[PDB]
Nucleic acid binder design. Sequence first.
DNA 1: GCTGATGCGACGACGGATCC
DNA 2: GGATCCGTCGAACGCATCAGC
Length: 271
Amino acid sequence: ALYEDPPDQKTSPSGKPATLKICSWNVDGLRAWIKKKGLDWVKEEAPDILCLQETKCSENKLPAELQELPGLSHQYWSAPDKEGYSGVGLLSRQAPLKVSYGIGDQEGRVIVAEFDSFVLVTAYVPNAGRGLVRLEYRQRWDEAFRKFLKGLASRKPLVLCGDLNVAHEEIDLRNPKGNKKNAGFTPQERQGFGELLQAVPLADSFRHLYPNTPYAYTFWTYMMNARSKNVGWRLDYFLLSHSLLPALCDSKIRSKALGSDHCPITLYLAL
DNA sequence: GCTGATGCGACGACGGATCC
DNA sequence: GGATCCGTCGAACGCATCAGC
């Protein structure tokens, strides 16, 4: 069945107005994404902060359009050995207080940015691989990432966004039965997600607001016209510290924005 | 400099078995 | 014998390198 994201809820359940708009997007090739008008969609969304994953592009090769974003002028980029794979980016209206890269362990998968009242982490979580060939590495990465997140020295609440490369529960993908042995829906990856929520701790912004809504995905394989059929997976998330839930206005899935095999997601917080 | 081949990374459609 | 379950296989993309000119 197709899906239509509900209207933007820009007021917290208590009645306060959203003051921060964050957008996260696995662009699957930043230069390709830019040629497919991805940046015109970003300008329409007008977020305060924009996080990109799988840019596959070192900094010296960022297209000039990225220098013409006056509302997103503080930009931090991180790329891996394997040029052309992985790579993440964080663009912000306001300068962060602090920026770092990695999870303490140059893989180009994580950017950490401390703002006035919260710490933002954007992540491109390693894929378990076709045939699960890198599933054990993923499991080790999950555990190191949890530890890193828990151990963040700031007593500030946490927002974690990006492509976490797992559909947490059967409601998070179209074909759960035939994918329980595929990357992104193994019992090992699902358990790692549950442990991330438990240990840090974190809530899944979208599922907390829409706990029973099926067919909401953020990824569709390019092949077999899966997107047109909405055969997809929910792989991209905003996860929030418990204390941030009263500030949570909405968590969106921008199903119609093209340019990649993932669609943008967007968080509204009242801070 | 530019093109196209090739390599590499990132599952839904389908065919067959089992079950009541 | 429709529903389900299971394992097998080809395929849309982006980016790097390489060969050729």
